[PDB]
Amino acid sequence: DIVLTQSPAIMSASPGEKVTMTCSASSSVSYIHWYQQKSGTSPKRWIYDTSRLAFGVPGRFSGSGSGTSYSLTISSMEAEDAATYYCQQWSSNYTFGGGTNLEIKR
Amino acid sequence: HSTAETTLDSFFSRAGLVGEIDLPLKGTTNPNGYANWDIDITGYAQMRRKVELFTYMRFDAEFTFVACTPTGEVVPQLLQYMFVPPGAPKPDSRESLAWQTATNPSVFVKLSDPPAQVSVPFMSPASAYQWFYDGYPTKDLEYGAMPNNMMGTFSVRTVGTSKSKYPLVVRIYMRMKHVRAWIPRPMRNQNYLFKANPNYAGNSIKPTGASRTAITTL
Amino acid sequence: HSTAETTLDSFFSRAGLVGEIDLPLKGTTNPNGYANWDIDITGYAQMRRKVELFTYMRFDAEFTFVACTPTGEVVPQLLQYMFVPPGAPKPDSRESLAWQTATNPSVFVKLSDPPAQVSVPFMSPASAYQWFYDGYPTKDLEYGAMPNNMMGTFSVRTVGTSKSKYPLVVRIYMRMKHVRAWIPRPMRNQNYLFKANPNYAGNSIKPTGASRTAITTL
Amino acid sequence: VAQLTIGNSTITTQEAANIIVGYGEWPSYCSDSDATAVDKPTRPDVSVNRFYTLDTKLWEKSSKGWYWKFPDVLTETGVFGQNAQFHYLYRSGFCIHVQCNASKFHQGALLVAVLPEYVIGTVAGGTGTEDTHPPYKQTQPGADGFELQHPYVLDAGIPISQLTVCPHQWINLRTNNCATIIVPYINALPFDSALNHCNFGLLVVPISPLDYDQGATPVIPITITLAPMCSEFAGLR
Amino acid sequence: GFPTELKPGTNQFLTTDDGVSAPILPNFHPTPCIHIPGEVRNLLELCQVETILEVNNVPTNATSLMERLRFPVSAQAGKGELCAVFRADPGRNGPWQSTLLGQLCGYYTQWSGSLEVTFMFTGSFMATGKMLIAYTPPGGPLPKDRATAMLGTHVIWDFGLQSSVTLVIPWISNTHYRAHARDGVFDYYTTGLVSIWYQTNYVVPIGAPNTAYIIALAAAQKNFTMKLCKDASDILQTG
Amino acid sequence: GFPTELKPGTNQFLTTDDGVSAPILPNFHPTPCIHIPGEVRNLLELCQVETILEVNNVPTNATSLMERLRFPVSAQAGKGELCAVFRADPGRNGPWQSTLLGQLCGYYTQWSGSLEVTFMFTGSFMATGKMLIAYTPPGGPLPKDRATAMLGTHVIWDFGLQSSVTLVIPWISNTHYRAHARDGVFDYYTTGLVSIWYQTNYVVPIGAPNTAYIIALAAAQKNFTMKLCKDASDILQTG
Amino acid sequence: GFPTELKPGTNQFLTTDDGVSAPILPNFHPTPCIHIPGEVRNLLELCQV
Fold this sequence. Notes:
This is part of a larger assembly, with 1 copy of chain A, 2 copies of chain B, 1 copy of chain D and 3 copies of chain E. By secondary structure, chain A is mainly beta. Chain A contains no helices and 10 strands. In chain A, the strands form 3 sheets. A 4-stranded antiparallel sheet of chain A has the order 1-3-8-7, with no helix packed on it. In chain A, a hairpin with a 3-residue loop joins strand 5 (44-48) and strand 6. By secondary structure, chain D is mainly β. Chain D has 2 helices and 13 strands. In chain D, strand 1 and strand 2 (10-13) form a beta hairpin. In chain E, the strands form 2 sheets. In chain E, strands 3, 4, 6, 9, 11 and 12 form a 6-stranded antiparallel sheet that branches. Chain E has a 4-stranded antiparallel sheet with strand order 5-10-7-8. The longest helix of chain E is centred in the middle third of the chain and has 6 residues, at 100-105. Chain E is mostly beta strands. The termini of chain E are far apart. The chains are: A mainly beta, B mainly beta, D mainly beta, E mainly beta. Chain F binds chain G through residues 1-9, 14, 16-18, 227, 229, and chain G through 2-7, 9-11, 13, 19, 21-22, 24-27, 29.
């Protein structure tokens, strides 16, 4: 009964510009984690404890947030990043976010 | 083979910045060309946690005064630094008679003259300054209040009947000397919220140190 | 266990402000760029009552001079402080030859130079300064006048043939040293009316201290 | 095994496990050349100094930990609480004894340490912007004690992981059950108030949680017995 | 020359620095100090002197000020009645202000020692009776009645036998700091209390006045001390 | 007067110059130091104290923070399995941050000495088994398996016999300098490693829990030392 | 104080004056000199090679 709302649902970057995806919570939260899911493949690990990066992840990805509003920032954007990004909470009922369809603009 | 650096005195030496007075010409800040600074040794951020390692302490402080204009300029202006011991009345105005009370040590110096410097003794009427007090002074707001830890106030002002012609900035450094400490205690691992009590954020309770994935991975 | 603070010397140390000279440019006050200050130790308000605790006293005085412009500014102006011992003639003008009489100690100093400071001995031809004299000097207006209590005069002036270019303010502090006192007496409990005698207000005769309702209520 | 007695109090305890004399000092008295050499401070020996056995607390799997304040705990209790209250000043040393009673089929580890000037800090609202000061029931719990709510930081923003720096002793169920601690008078003054200032606080927390298979007693009684050492008082009222 | 580095504080004027300065008159030989009776060396000498304590600090009417010095006892007062009361607060307002001790405490910030009050009965020689004088240490509230005060540290005084009696106040300490209004005052709290009750009534034969007064005299023991010179006064040298 | 020439450095303010300055209150006699228990004189006293090492520094969930203090062993773990592992890096992040030693290393730049970890089994009294605890000096990679670790400096621990065991780390030296990013950090490299394997499985009789925890306690030997005061902290006095 | 008169050369910087100056790190105990082979003390040692 702790819901995570992600905005926006769909996004399009140039690329070479920054990208700011948001995960908002209905109640105050301790930390947030992020996954990635390209099509046909399962979710991959991306960011944990809000700001720490999984081994693979490029350094151009960032993480911040405190309390109830957290955000994943990408600068700069490259055609290899286009995936769906979910947030997740670990305080009570382990809930996932709705995801954000990141896409290439042309 | 030597362990001189790990001594108390070695640990607490160094004159740190604990105060900064602003005496602007046009301003909301200290409009009467004077200011009162009750001695707070927490003024040096890093300090609080270092001293709060011990329950009781004792020491002398060497104060050094650095004054200039905001750009760090030197000008022909004379200044009065007044130390009002605890129990003595601080000046309410730029003409309070406190400025002339002999029992309030005062020292004068020109901005040109090198830094002013004086030593202040172990004031406390108690046998030692104590950072923690588990009681009240004879749910309350007087909890953890050991007042007998006051060192005094430092009143600063431009000399003369009239406002100074220049905008001034005084910085107060403090070297702690002849230190003795008792009853060591757990190193603060949570963020400080208030200057008075040890209260912390009951939501944002963080693990003392960096975490990891598994207890089998490095 | 120590009682060093309750000694006479301890009680009377501290250099207090006992004088302030004004040397304005345009003014009604000291129009000739000079001034004569007969040494009055009552200059520090609090003083009178403290000394009037004893009948006889003896001591040396350390004088320290603080000079600046009204805003407490420092300027390139030279000054002459002349001490005219009792019996010596004070200067009637800014060109009186007294200013050059060798037998009148004089000290020169620039406003920039730190405070001037000199010690003055126990003048009095008597064995001790006596605050009370129950007689007349060989209904009268000479009652309670022990003249042999004069310390002397301090004549101040800007150096040079011409008036100074700046408005000046001199402050005189005085630390009493090597003090000895005899015959203690009742602490003045009534307000002072004159610098000479102990006369008080015979209408406004107030009770030494705070009163209360009944002698059975606290 | 043998039983020691101090007046009308007789406790059954083990021969002589390792005792912890806090800071290497023994609770002694205070000589004649002090602050109040006139009001000769009367030192209780008779009943005042004996074995008090506080209301046993029950260890549980979920237990967070407990703490009592001194001398608060006793200022309510008996003829000692008698002196502490109707007297102006107080200085006293303490012998504290903590014991559990558990079958060789229970497991746990309680750290038991004493901390001078134990100043409680509440949560402060939650978000950190409320300057709420701990109540009186939290600052001086009495003889029932009080439960920690944030053991990890000892309800005061300090790692417990470092509490060992204080006079402590361990109680590992699979090795011992009784822990003993001698505490000297510790304060920045010779004497002080017995009702306003709590020189220290007794801490007892489960570092390794209590555990057992279904069927074994689910709660382990922890019994605190304590005795005043070289206790002095001055200025009767 | 000789190598030197000036350190901070150079050129400063400390109003409490007791260094030496140049003698204005080097040749002058000041008239020799001769012997004068009663030289004082340390103020605490004065503090040990008995001064009249204005316990009866109630009349203010200019011509009745002499009345503050003495309070009275009379036949009209019944057994047990509370005659008078006051605190052991040398430096604070009230009764002690009249004593010399009190006035000296004012030029200091802290202090402590045993005090000593002496009572003098100035009634007719033919009068007799008993007064109970009790001291309630700091904290203890003024005893309800004579009997409860009778259980505290007390002294039965029969002015039929001895015209004087001296009570000792074991201890008083103005050490507990207080920052009330916005003006910090190192105050008492140690307001020890001295109550005085008519143990018996005032008894007198025909021909003797049915009222008599008493005088309070106080001083401090040799164990008295003071700390922190603090010049303070309502009386100052007028312009 | 006396000939002198001022040398460079005259009039300067060194924040570390420990010269003397003028006493503001020359007459003041500060309240005497009395005896207080447990005075500390040199920080290295503290470094030799056993503090709980949060080896299990994995849970972050606020209410499971107490779990970092103890890690466990269970029946489910088969012989040879690696129980846990960590480095001998007092000053760096991870487990050591919880120990007091760790926190003190932070106020210093360099250090070296022998360490000492003690393990405490807090399981049921009825349990028994063996744990292999091995130390792989700096450079040596974590041993592949139990057997290869068995060849290194190891200790077989039978908590069936002794509930405690203490391991000594011969040496650790944070002396090798590193200028990575653009921020120079005098780092370890001496990351000695301590591995712990289930020599045998966890054995227990009916009636005893099939899991037990262990507590790590560390301190440094008397040969420990530190150099270069360096104040650093994430926790500071808030505005 | 103590009477003094400053003489010419006061406040000057001689690049060859071998006086003493204030130690920046008073508490620092520099790592001890150990024995190293072939120490040279006076250049003329080299000239004889």
